[PDB]
Design a protein around this ligand. Structure first.
Ligand SMILES: Nc1ncnc2c1ncn2[C@@H]1O[C@H](COP(=O)(O)OP(=O)(O)O)[C@@H](O)[C@H]1O
Ligand SMILES: Nc1ncnc2c1ncn2[C@@H]1O[C@H](COP(=O)(O)OP(=O)(O)O)[C@@H](O)[C@H]1O
Ligand SMILES: Nc1ncnc2c1ncn2[C@@H]1O[C@H](COP(=O)(O)OP(=O)(O)O)[C@@H](O)[C@H]1O
Ligand SMILES: Nc1ncnc2c1ncn2[C@@H]1O[C@H](COP(=O)(O)OP(=O)(O)O)[C@@H](O)[C@H]1O
Ligand SMILES: Nc1ncnc2c1ncn2[C@@H]1O[C@H](COP(=O)(O)OP(=O)(O)O)[C@@H](O)[C@H]1O
Lengths: 371, 371, 371, 371, 371
């Protein structure tokens, strides 16, 4: 039999089969409901659209995300998401397939327990397993040591691993990610008159971000370059027409990752939490960690982010070590790729949580050595 | 057939064949176990690393020494050490080779008896013999008289020998050695801010000691020189970067050998236990003993220790005798070299403890005239 | 003339006059700076708030600690702390008051040297003296022998003293303390759903710890009791309503003192380091040390710490001994009380360091006989 | 006026008044000095503890014996011992008391000369006298003939006396005694696992010896009995718990008196030096000497020593003699008892050395007919 | 054919060929045996060293003399001594050489009988003969009349001879000699603190005596001058150092020959036994005997002994007689010189005891006319 690999993430569902090179179903993790009245009798319209259909009916729906920061907040919505994923995108019967789920470090425990309970009671899968996103990223990267920085859409986290041993006291988790970058871009785009307030203009702003934003290698020099020239100013065409022109806020948006004070957060940038995780690890694995700094997740896809991260970590660490940043082109799907590798490993077929184990030990069996 | 020569020591295993000029397997006498959880499934990692592999995986393991001061405290660990030595470093079958083991004077008797029992029951050797480290050092030195000072890593001892007769009432044993010097250096390095607490930072401190420490010919003058100048201050580069600078504690560390009150011990320095052993011997061999003062073992490898020892013993002994200190460059391996010489001697092939003798007389046969 | 006793500690400054029964001024050693912009013109607000004031404006400020683990890292805001202590809490001119300050064992030398340089040049005190915290704790406890465990907020140490003589080779120092317990509690509350990330929320977590945590007498039985019953849950009220309930976390937090592997340290618990510091001492005084085990400092204030530690040390020591744990109710002020006693002795008035003494011998005079 | 009988011994001072039945003050002849630094200010530590106090503060002192083998090696320490004896134990003023002091045969002459110089100048006694220990033993035994074997703590000696005349050419002195037995017991316990190294553990070993050792009647049969049975082993309770169990070490320690080759001496046992002194004596008195063999001193106090020595001397002497060994229960104090008897004798009152005689003839007066 | 002349004596074997001016082999008559353990395998050490070889290894051996006072008390040792003398010092086959041996007057008969039995059965000489030592002294002196005083190392004797006739009733023998002088010097050296107890230190004391001792002309005046001045003090350097200073015991040692009460003997001095032998002779052969008083042997080698003995004998004898004392410089070897002369005499060749005479008459042939 084959196992499914559902990388829920927070803002993009990625599912597929264990043993493939890529997911076969990538769609947004949104659930939309109509907000207007509806006049044409016989239209027979539905009450809630899931996934990629909601993005077509944006102008009529209110789009809600069922996952805020890794954490699931709307369990009925999330159950709809899973039902859509199993039956409409993949077209499989979940009572014949083990399912490997992913989760971020340092989430509540009820999240994981309720996820297991759903997967066994509602969808009736034979086995299931919840994996950490950073470990799976390291599987897909081909390493066995290295400090991984998995910046998704809800959370950002560093997880240092050495020789296959993870150092839990050095795990860092930050709640700044692509969703906060989108909100900051919505906010600073009002300096030029453009206003995006609806829950469906957030998708337009996310598209603008993905297509035009980039990380500056030096922030003050790019500030001055934008103040003087106009060579970095680019245009974008809305779904309506009426092109908008983006100036220096092409690189002020992702700079929030290195200066979280822009959105009023207290914490330090990703370049500094990475270094603090290093310095919290031992002394005789720090050289390997410096040399194996692995990036994954969608928020690491900006142009120039690897070069910026290297410049910063190099200015932080001692001057005698080679600091190297691994940033594959298929970063966004690294967690899923690693999940497929892991679930196909023949050694892993004894780590599943079978259904009988659950029936006899309750949902608490998730936090056991299968953690 | 050939005999093996395993100089267990306390902190460095040295093994080889009888009839060679040097040991072919020198590795630390440590056994490491992982202390973190281990996340990558399929890693298939082991549960305990022995020898030189543990020093590579330092940052992940807890390193334990199975020999405290000559005495073996963890018999399972020591059995792992021996298994590694026989099968992985030397690649020999111990049921075809006699084995010569070494031990320090004035150890418990159960140490030696249990060692014999292990070597005959577990490893199944045909013969075995336990030798004293100082006697073997004197074999390797080419002498037949002389007072030998064998400062290893667990124990220090003087053993005066004259014309091949050892004087047991004049044997001295002190429990100050390289391990205590390492602990004292860890402690006094905190005066400059460097902190080494982990069981794997002790190895870094041992490296610092070996590479930078030296014995002062005069302690107050070097104290004043370090207080005034900076010409004796040297630097070292950790596995992490961040060089550390060592000042006057380059020579305060090995000065504990001549002033054991530094670590709160009651006893007297090595220069004074040597002289007390002399003065406890007869009156008409003291001139030869003064002239044949032999050093061996790793803790005698400091720069200037021979000159310091000579200055001290010369100030102690009467003014009309030539005091001479023999300190070969291959000091650290003298016990092993002498062991190889002894086991190759054709006269010695009748001093082995055969397996039938053991089977008929129990492990008590070790303390007989083969003592 | 009277002397000032300033037990600057690490996390609480306790000051007062020598000869009083308790410290007069007790406030957190915190320097806060505003992180937002400030709009109301005429507010005339200041740049940095110190001490107890900074906890009122805690929501606007970003709080720094000038002392990390006993050691002083930031010196400018430490001068700010001292200035606030002298002029705003005590209202005394330090030009006519000798000052007694405390420090933990096994600290850098530059700490003391800069401390006295500042106290003589910036504040112009006529005399000063730096004392060890454990000795003052023994003074206040009224013993003259006994092994004292002084768990503050940055550092934990054992100092065995017999008959008025301290045995420095048996002094242990551990960098696990109240701030590490606060960080572990922050990290462990996350699994229940609550997130505290800001330096202003670290103070709320410290309050939760102080008011709800306790040491379990039997850790496994308490874990089972929490996994079965619910009679352990207590509720706390955040500054904005939002009641939170904690179970396991009540005793899993201070258990880090007895199992430092919870926060990834390699060392042994406070009970085991106390026992090891006893076993480092001479065999004749271990009776009195076992019978006079003195606790002091804030981190020793959990309910059940004394009973737990007595149980542990009793199971470690031989069966013939009487183990006693001395834990006064005015425990967390013992260092200050002893400091006042000491500075109040007529025998002490010739052990200060004078102004001219310093002016002639430089700051190096701190380590010499005027200790 | 009454005289003072101070039998200073070597390892035990015994003092009192002439005319008593027993010494009033009995304490070890020990001077201790603190070896640690001392932190409690104001308690006013002193610099040297002498006597029974040094055994209470034993854990933090270095204990020195001012007298090595009968001979005094530290005159300042000995003056402290005598001052303590006169003022803090007997509470008498030596300006008004004659003092009888005791010495072993065949010591240096400067010993007696400096002893009397001190007693007349430092302490200003009105008279003094130096007696031989064996003669006083024979007084206290109620004999006037007999060969006395006085085994103290530094020196053993035989002094054959017949009819009140001593045979000086037959006096034998041996430098093996209780101190060498203690050192041998330390060195021989080390082979069972226990190690006592400090001068403060020498006292614990001496206590073990006194309390558990005995003399075997047949050494080979007791060795075989210990090798086969286990009925010989006793346990002892160290001053911190951790009982130790000793087997054949109980009778192997005092066997050094009969086989001084155990500690590398060449001489003959006490049973053989006794017989050799007898055979040096004239042929007409050997029968009386065989019949009056008197034991005294602390080292003659082992269980079974009288029976052993009778067996040995009987096997040595001709088979027609009555060998008889006189061993009173108050052996240890025989020298003091005899000294009291002698100083109370009325004939003795013109054999003191007066202050006038000393001021007249210098310290040389000690070796004159006023011996 | 040539005869061997072996003069054994008690403490110096000296042998050679008949017809030489001196012995070619002079060495001590000691047999040493190792008393320590022996650790170096392959050292191949022996079990007993004899002669001068045993003097180089004193620090390891226990030295025995096989001849106590003229009398041989260890026949195995004596056989070893003779074997060494024949084969290693002289290198001759004793089966082809007659052998002349010596002994003192008034020894047991079995000594002489067993001597010849050994020399015929074991060493298998063709002939042998035993001669009185004093007669051979008189041969070497070039006289045929005189009273000869032969002080060896175990025995002293006078033998008056007149015109070649020996007067057996006037022969005196005294058991005071160099060995007793060495023992007395060891005993009185302890007055200054030097102690020599080992059989190997007896040899150091013998060398001291030989090099420093002398006979005083007036004992009381020399004692007075030693008490007053310090011009008699002479220093000696032991095999190590601690040069010893010898005062009046330079001449108190050999004064035991003139006052044997010093070592507790009843007899009279050598001067008085010489005079008594004279007055024991005939009243017609006393003038020649007074005029031919011949000294020989090693104990007559002190500076001043001839003058002292002349003063004493002159004070004893009548005033009209001229006393003369013949003291050649080669006194120590006079017995050997005379033995060589006698054995080379052609008249003597009929006086040997042939092997056939022995075979037919038993060892009784030695006291017979074959003397
Ligand atoms: N090329 C890009 N540049 C910048 N941001 C991107 C890019 N592609 C995707 N993103 C951001 O990544 C986020 C999705 O990351 P993803 O890896 O899907 O995490 P998750 O699966 O947890 O949602 C989106 O919010 C989007 O804004
Ligand atoms: N060059 C050096 N200088 C100072 N110490 C050294 C040096 N080389 C080795 N050592 C010390 O010697 C010890 C090892 O001594 P060794 O002869 O191996 O004894 P053993 O074999 O009993 O461990 C180590 O603890 C190390 O600290
Ligand atoms: N009742 C309590 N229970 C547990 N911990 C406490 C309690 N009161 C204070 N503490 C802890 O003690 C620490 C302060 O200890 P303190 O004696 O002030 O050391 P310092 O003076 O070095 O700051 C604080 O971090 C706090 O968390
Ligand atoms: N019961 C005993 N058994 C064996 N040895 C003893 C006993 N009592 C005392 N001793 C030994 O006797 C010694 C003291 O002898 P002592 O008569 O005091 O001589 P001195 O007075 O010269 O010191 C001590 O070293 C002690 O070890
Ligand atoms: N120069 C000397 N002065 C004093 N005594 C001497 C001297 N030379 C030898 N002796 C003593 O003479 C003894 C040896 O005498 P020796 O003639 O050998 O007699 P024997 O041959 O019977 O042993 C030795 O004990 C030594 O002490």
């Amino acid at each position: 039999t084959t196992a499914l690999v559902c990388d829920n993430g927070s803002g993009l569902v990625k599912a597929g089969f264990a043993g493939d090179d890529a997911p076969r179903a990538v769609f947004p993790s949104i659930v939309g409901r109509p907000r207007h009245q509806g006049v044409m009798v016989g239209m027979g319209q539905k009450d809630s659209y899931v996934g990629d259909e909601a993005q077509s009916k944006r102008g009529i729906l209110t789009l809600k995300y069922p996952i805020e920061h890794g954490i699931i907040t709307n369990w009925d919505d999330m159950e709809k998401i899973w039902h859509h994923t199993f039956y409409n995108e993949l077209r499989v019967a979940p009572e014949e397939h083990p399912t490997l789920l992913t989760e971020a470090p340092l989430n509540p425990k009820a999240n994981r327990e309720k996820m297991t309970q759903i997967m066994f009671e509602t969808f009736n899968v034979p086995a299931m397993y919840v994996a950490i996103q950073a470990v799976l990223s390291l599987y897909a990267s081909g390493r066995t040591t290295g400090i991984v920085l998995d910046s998704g859409d809800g959370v950002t986290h560093n997880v240092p691993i050495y020789e296959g041993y993870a150092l839990p006291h050095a795990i860092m988790r930050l709640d700044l990610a692509g969703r906060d970058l989108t909100d900051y871009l919505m906010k600073i785009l009002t300096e030029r008159g453009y206003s995006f307030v609806t829950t469906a203009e957030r998708e337009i702003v996310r598209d603008i971000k993905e297509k035009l934003c980039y990380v500056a290698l030096d922030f003050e020099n790019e500030m001055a370059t934008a103040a003087s020239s106009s060579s970095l100013e680019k245009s974008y065409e809305l779904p309506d027409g009426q092109v908008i022109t983006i100036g220096n806020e092409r690189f002020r948006c992702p700079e929030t990752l290195f200066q979280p004070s822009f959105i009023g957060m207290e914490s330090a940038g990703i370049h500094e939490t990475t270094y603090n995780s290093i310095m919290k690890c031992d002394i005789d694995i720090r050289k390997d960690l410096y040399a194996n700094n692995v990036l994954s997740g969608g928020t690491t896809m900006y142009p120039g982010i690897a070069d910026r991260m290297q410049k910063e970590i190099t200015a932080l660490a001692p001057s005698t070590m080679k600091i190297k940043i691994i940033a594959p082109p298929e970063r966004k799907y690294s967690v899923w790729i690693g999940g497929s590798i892991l679930a196909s490993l023949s050694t892993f077929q004894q780590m599943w949580i079978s259904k009988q184990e659950y029936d006899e030990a309750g949902p608490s069996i998730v936090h056991r050595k299968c953690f």
